[PDB]
Amino acid sequence: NQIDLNVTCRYAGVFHVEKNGRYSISRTEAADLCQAFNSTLPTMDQMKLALSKGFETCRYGFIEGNVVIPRIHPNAICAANHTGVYILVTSNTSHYDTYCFNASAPPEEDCTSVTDLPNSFDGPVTITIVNRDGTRYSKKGEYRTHQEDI
Ligand SMILES: Nc1cccc2c1CNCC2
């Protein structure tokens, strides 16, 4: 009973979280996951500022009201060569990664590891934070509040 959460650097408080290495987070689960990090889904404005500080990914993820990919460098296999905060317009499906926003993070790039999940609640799941440099932090708990998500 195990969940891996792959996390990025923070940029103006905004970071990306991927569950189990694949698109697998619903919009309800995304809000609960950010809440476990003492964070919220970013607004578009928060995401644009993060982009301006160096944030880019190649993965769709939730922000408050849209699903996006922040892009700095044009890449043909990431958001169809677009730059800026690329907004997903048309999709059949409902599960993506998430972005999260932590107001307590540093104002610019913070590429230190994440070593806690401060607002997880009691539960039976082994939750492992995996950083890009491989650094791991594990704890037993739960973050999902909606039964539809388990
Ligand atoms: N960001 C991160 C952290 C740990 C593992 C992985 C990522 C990004 N996606 C590939 C795997």
From Swiss-Prot:
Positions that bind hyaluronan: R22, R59, Y60, Y86
Residues bearing attached sugar chains per UniProt: N6, N38, N81, N92, N102
Tissue expression per record: Expressed in the intestinal epithelium.
Coiled coil: none
Domain Link positions: 13-102
Cysteines joined through disulfide linkages: C9-C111, C34-C100, C58-C78
Domain of life the protein comes from: Eukaryota
Post-translation changes: N-glycosylated. O-glycosylated; contains chondroitin sulfate glycans which can be more or less sulfated.
Protein's cellular compartments: Cell membrane; Cell projection, Microvillus; Secreted
Function recorded in the entry: Cell-surface receptor that plays a role in cell-cell interactions, cell adhesion and migration, helping them to sense and respond to changes in the tissue microenvironment. Participates thereby in a wide variety of cellular functions including the activation, recirculation and homing of T-lymphocytes, hematopoiesis, inflammation and response to bacterial infection.
SUBUNIT field: Interacts with PKN2. Interacts with TIAM1 and TIAM2. Interacts with HA, as well as other glycosaminoglycans, collagen, laminin, and fibronectin via its N-terminal segment. Interacts with UNC119. Interacts with PDPN (via extracellular domain); this interaction is required for PDPN-mediated directional migration and regulation of lamellipodia extension/stabilization during cell spreading and migration. Interacts with RDX, EZR and MSN (via FERM domain). Interacts with EGFR. Interacts with CD74; this complex is essential for the MIF-induced signaling cascade that results in B cell survival.
Domain notes: The lectin-like LINK domain is responsible for hyaluronan binding.
Protein name, entry field: CD44 antigen
Gene name of the record: Cd44
Residues of the full protein shown: 22 to 171 of 778
